[PDB]
Design a protein around this ligand. Structure first.
Ligand code: NA
Ligand code: NA
Lengths: 831, 832
């Protein structure tokens, strides 16, 4: 019978090409001891010292005696970008693509006397294998399990594109009666004939047997046999939705028939479900209408050790289901098997796609390798009922439109692109005609004007109105105009979202400030549009989780360490009717600070996400009133005063009482500096920005810029300036990324003493900008030119010890070349 | 007038030896662009590729025109471990000491018409500059600010051991009156003669002027003038304590006697306080009993970028001060100045020490460089009122007694050591008779036999009874013993604590499981002994914050490295604050709960409460669990966990007001008796051989503590518990693999028929090599598995098998061949 285990242990690994490291006689003593899954560049210095090259994986296989008359199948669940397999120095085969599995019958190349050498030649630098752009162009390693399967010589075909060789489909489904079709290949690898018996046992969702199918066959030696057995129509079927995921086990045993011995066995689930996308009326599931409540999802495990990302795939999914999503868009996800299994068993419709993104260049064999990835994805995941559609292209004109302008420049690229698109579109339905095809566009109409939208069953629009330029209400406007022009093209919003930093907070949120509060606004707008519009089949939000790459990736709902952002609970409130949701949406904001008048309490908004009709918010036991909820949200102006306040909210749902609680930190900052309130104070201002930044260098909260008023402090002159480049030499990137430009001076009305002043600059204007600085009429810097000394986009921090013998600190800026700017200022009383 | 700024920007750097890197013409185009501070080696392996040697720092100096007449003093607040500085290829000077400052008058080497090149050679592999052992042996870089100061040609001495040049101290302090002595050195770097006015103004804590002192002085060219000005005795002085930190500012101004023009100006705080240490009655502060509630502290900041570690020193202090601490014990702290400024102003007593530790080597120059460092430390901090005692050694016998075991190879090292101890004790009292001296020992009576404890004014014991062996009561017993044999040695417990890991929790915590709960058991035993024992002056806990080192147990702190307090932080806060209400549900350390559940009966797990309220009431999801009266500032509730997202809520009455705390956590129930339905989406994982829950950082699974097999359930068969303390290769989930069931016979789950994924976890930890097979219901999956031969000792193996169960149970059997069978963890989950 059949036996499957992992060989993930006791590997040696050498980063670099090497002189037949496939040889069994090799000295791998000084290579690195590694344990698979193994991910290559888990240390990011950008392009410089990010490894693009060939690596070598080596492990000894000492075989078990119980396998000497058994075929041995070696499978690699995923290995990117491409690997070649050496048993004992000999080439068994290669693979191209780091998101599908591959498998090789390695029985010939193996002896049972001396230990065998398994060597793998992996390469992440291959521009002829998708993806060719984006964060995963160089995703390298054997970053998934590796399996040794042993079977009798009469087995199912485990070398059909890395799949199970089995394919269960349902050719007709209705509420009353559905048909089943079980297909696959059997392979005789013994040197003679064989008379066998093929059984199909079909179980109900409750465990009991429903139907048995026996059929029996003969096979000349070496023969591979193609079976295809219909089944008795299932009467009154148990139908499958993400809310009701009823699965029928299909056990497929293979018996010797002279002796009724069991040989090989292979279980698979299937389920009964039908669906259609209507261009006017939306999605339908089992006859009944249904909103796709989706999120996108690709490889995004956090690096937790040397060459080792996390393995949280499963508990990640629990977090999607408890948010109440019913749809997942999958791409760049190695061993997506693991994810779809839970999409089947726990409930979540799915699309998956091979990753052909951004541009179709003239790279030889790109097209050929892409069609193979498309076939592999479909065959390896055929038997998942959660999968209702296969894609293959994502924003395929995005880089083309940046790189080619004249229609004489685009004609050879568009020809090439429509060509690969149609090619893969036929491969798709040649491989599986029981699912819908889709293609995701970026927000331009040239996916219509070039023909790419007439190819696929349905179409995805990646819309970022209100993020990458534009206004929030152009989201509905873009979709409306798309449904007016092309009403037969049923639409999904396959990507939307806005990035956010836990470090950033605003009371006046605008796009590209990266504040928690703006992503909350942007998603508070989009989510009703997706639900209350009928001709929108639903959406898939930008990748569920935040992630980083050396080569903007913070638009998710869950932080990289798997804590949900506050806004997670906004979806949960809107998508889970079954349980009460009550979230004080201030986990993202436990380090609060504001400017205070004398002893007048400070008011900062505290938001609440709930699905309760009304909710009460208390602080230190003092009811702040009741508030009716609209769009699952409610905002209180909370009077922060005391330093360790305690927020508490409650309300009612379905008879019972629902509560939440949370402790935060609040620090007040004086509006008018006298000498009591200056002591132990570090007054830090995020010049030229409207955001509270909370520092990782210092854990100080750098306050928003405010204009100088008599008795107080603030800026004099200038206008807000923003840049979006990586600022080097600091962890506090965002503080340097916003300045006040054409600044005249900065002033604090502060008593006499000795003060430490820090000033923060970064030149972001690639005549050069040079200026002088003075304090209380005495020159501390005669000519400061941030770009000649640091360079553009590096960071400067200058600290000055100042002896103030006036009643104010008047810092002022002296234009010489270009413009005066200030990126941050910090004041500190010393004496 | 005095102008002082940083030259931290615009540096190029090169990791390794280079020649002509000092010269101004040199090409540093292809060098690394950096901003100071700059810490070396923010990357973790040990002796391999953690850098040891020379490194070069380059910057261009554009001297302003209005500075042409002035003197230029260059101050490096700290460089580790050694720095040599070049101005335009010319060697200005040298420093030896990773923790003190250095200063140089660079006026003669600078050009005012061209640009200058500032060039610094840093060497961290210096086996003659303390510390020569421990986590800071190779701490390297210019990891503190670098400054340019420009003064007129008559100024205060900026080049006396890299200090301010001024020295203020109170010769007599009492309730009735005190005296104030202001000393310093005025420097004339002109070629002429100068006639000057020197003024000291003394301000009251409230800011008003108490007094002015003028004195005319005359200096030849190139002269250093040592002044020493008494002040009018201060009547009814405002006394300083950590709870009342009144400071008198002293402004020292240098004027030209003719034109009354301001030349230099140096502000300092002084303060009036006195103290003693008694062998019987402990510590006294302004004549009252005072118990030292202390914490240790050294360089602490987490890496936050390439070569860049945080500068959270001032926020790290508010944490110490809000816990209620009144004492801090400082060492391996570069530019401690910033810390002691908080001590002075916000209120906390300090002791400081240069880092001589572990062994005194036979190293030419070491003793000399230590003396030079002790002086630097005292002169740079002489004016900090909060400093009450200086120290220089710390377990100076620890490594000596390990490496050497015969009294012949011991005799030279013990001579070398008392020799250096006396030298430094002489130097200390020479530099500062205003402050008591101290030494920190490890827990061995050898410091009394050798006579090391007859040297300093007080002694400190670094005691870990209950952690490194013994049991918690050996603590008070050790001190009880010490006080009785040397009663004239006043005692501070100068270090204590116990390591902990947020990932681990136990209901029966024993030393070295690293469970959060043992650390609380340990600190709940120690703190009362510290308060209630008279002859103990106080304690200083282990380093306030967890920290990782890249060399060769670094988690005994009260605060995690992300600067979040552990839960036991509030045990200290409740015992040490009386001003504010403290009421903390001790469960931030434990928000991923899980446990074994009978049917649907609720799973009882403990929830501890730290507070200084007299009685607390705990609710879960709104259901009161009833009030509890609090003792030793703690209350435990046995809580019934049901729902998967409970809401804990406590309340009580402090000072007639109401006090509340609340917290949402997570609970996963795991079924004791499996069936075809509770396996649906289950992942049953067992920390085999441990009695501890382990929440994983790979998966987020909470691996349940081992239970033995009982019919209808699951569990182990056979074998003893076994534990290890080496770290483990190839996994983030270390503690999982550090405990196993040794000589295990098997593991059995009673589960239905079906297809199951079984994952087994091994690490051989026993230097024939063990080998065994593994059968699951009679099928042989591993035929000859040997973790040590295949992988290695202390490497992880994760084997994973797909198996088809036709019995009503999964009976895993271990079949020995050589050595013993063992299992560090097992995880099952149903596929079909
Ligand atoms: Na800014
Ligand atoms: Na274990």
């Amino acid at each position: 019978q059949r036996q499957t285990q992992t060989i993930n242990d006791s590997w040696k690994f050498l980063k670099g090409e090497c002189t037949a490291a496939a040889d069994s006689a090799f000295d791998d003593s000084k290579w690195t001891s590694i344990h698979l899954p193994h991910t290559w560049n888990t240390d990011a210095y950008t392009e410089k010292d990010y490894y693009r090259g060939t690596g070598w994986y080596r492990r000894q296989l000492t075989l078990p005696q119980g396998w000497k008359e058994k075929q041995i199948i070696l499978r690699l669940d995923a290995a990117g970008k491409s690997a070649t397999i050496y048993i004992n120095g000999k080439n068994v085969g290669e693979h191209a693509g780091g998101y599908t599995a591959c498998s090789f019958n390695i029985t010939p190349f193996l002896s049972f006397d001396t230990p065998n050498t398994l060597a793998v030649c992996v390469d992440n630098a291959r521009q002829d294998i998708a993806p060719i752009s984006g964060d995963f162009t160089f995703f390298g390693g054997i970053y998934r399990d590796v399996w040794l399967t042993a079977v009798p010589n009469q087995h199912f075909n485990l070398t059909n594109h890395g799949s199970d060789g089995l394919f269960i489909s349902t050719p007709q489904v209705s509420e009353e009666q559905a048909t089943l079709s079980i297909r696959g290949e059997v392979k005789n690898d013994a040197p003679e004939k064989a008379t066998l018996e093929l059984t199909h046992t079909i179980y109900r969702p409750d465990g009991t047997l429903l139907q048995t199918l026996k059929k029996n066959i003969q096979l000349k030696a070496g023969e591979t046999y193609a079976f295809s057995n219909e089944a008795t129509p299932v009467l009154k079927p148990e139908l499958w939705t993400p809310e009701t995921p009823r699965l029928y086990r299909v056990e497929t045993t293979l018996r010797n028939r002279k002796t009724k011995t069991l040989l090989d066995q292979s279980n698979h689930y299937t389920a009964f479900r039908w669906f259609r996308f209507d261009g006017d009326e939306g999605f339908f599931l089992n006859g009944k209408p249904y909103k796709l409540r989706g999120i996108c999802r690709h490889q995004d495990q956090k690096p937790i050790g040397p060459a080792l990302t996390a393995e949280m795939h499963r508990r990640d999914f629990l977090l999607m289901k408890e948010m109440g999503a019913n749809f997942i868009r999958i791409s760049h996800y190695p061993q997506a098997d693991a994810l779809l299994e839970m999409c089947d068993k726990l409930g979540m419709l799915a699309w998956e796609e091979i990753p052909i993104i951004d541009i179709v260049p003239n790279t030889p064999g790109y097209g050929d390798n892409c069609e193979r990835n498309l076939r592999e994805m479909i065959r390896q995941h055929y038997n998942h009922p959660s999968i209702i559609t296969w894609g293959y292209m994502n924003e395929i004109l995005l880089v083309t439109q940046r790189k080619y302008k004249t229609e004489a420049e685009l004609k050879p690229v568009l020809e090439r692109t429509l060509a690969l698109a149609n090619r893969l579109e036929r491969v798709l339905k040649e491989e599986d005609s029981t699912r819908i095809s889709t293609m995701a566009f970026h927000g331009s109409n040239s996916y219509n004007e070039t023909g790419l939208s007439k190819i696929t069953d349905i179409v995805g629009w990646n819309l970022y109105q209100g993020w990458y330029g534009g206004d929030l209400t152009g989201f509905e406007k873009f979709l409306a105009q798309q449904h007016q022009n092309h009403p037969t093209h049923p639409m999904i919003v396959s990507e939307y979202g806005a990035g956010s930093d836990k470090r950033l907070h605003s009371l006046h949120p605008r796009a590209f400030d990266f504040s928690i509060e703006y992503q909350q606004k942007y998603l508070e707008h989009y989510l009703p549009v997706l639900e209350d519009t009928p001709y929108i089949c639903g959406g898939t939000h930008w990748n569920f989780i935040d992630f980083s790459s050396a080569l903007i990736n913070n638009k998710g709902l869950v932080y990289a360490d798997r804590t949900p952002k506050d806004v997670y609970h906004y979806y949960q409130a809107a998508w889970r009717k079954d349980i009460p949701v009550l979230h004080i949406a201030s986990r993202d904001w436990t380090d609060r600070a504001g400017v205070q008048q004398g002893n007048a309490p400070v008011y900062l908004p505290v938001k609440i996400y709930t699905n309760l009709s009304e909710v009460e918010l208390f602080i230190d036991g003092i009811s702040l009133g009741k508030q009716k909820t609209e769009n699952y949200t409610a905002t209180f102006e909370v009077p922060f005063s005391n330093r360790n306040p305690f927020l508490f909210a409650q309300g009612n749902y379905q008879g019972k009482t629902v509560q939440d609680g949370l402790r935060i930190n609040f620090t007040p900052i004086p509006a008018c500096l006298d000498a009591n309130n200056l002591k132990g104070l570090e007054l830090a201002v995020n010049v030229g920005s409207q955001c509270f930044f909370t520092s990782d260098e210092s854990q100080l909260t750098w306050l928003p810029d405010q204009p100088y008023a008599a008795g107080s402090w603030g800026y004099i002159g200038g206008k807000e300036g923003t840049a979006q480049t990586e600022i080097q030499n600091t962890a506090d990137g965002p503080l340097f990324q916003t300045l006040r430009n054409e600044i005249e001076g900065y002033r604090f009305d502060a008593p006499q003493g000795v003060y430490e002043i820090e000033l923060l600059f970064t030149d972001i204007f690639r005549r050069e900008s040079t200026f002088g600085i003075s304090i209380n009429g005495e020159v501390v810097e005669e000519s400061l030119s941030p770009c000649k000394e640091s360079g553009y986009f590096r960071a400067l921090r200058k600290k000055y010890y100042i002896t103030n013998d006036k009643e104010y600190i008047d810092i002022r800026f002296h234009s010489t070349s270009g413009t005066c700017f200030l990126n941050g200022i910090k004041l500190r009383n010393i004496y």
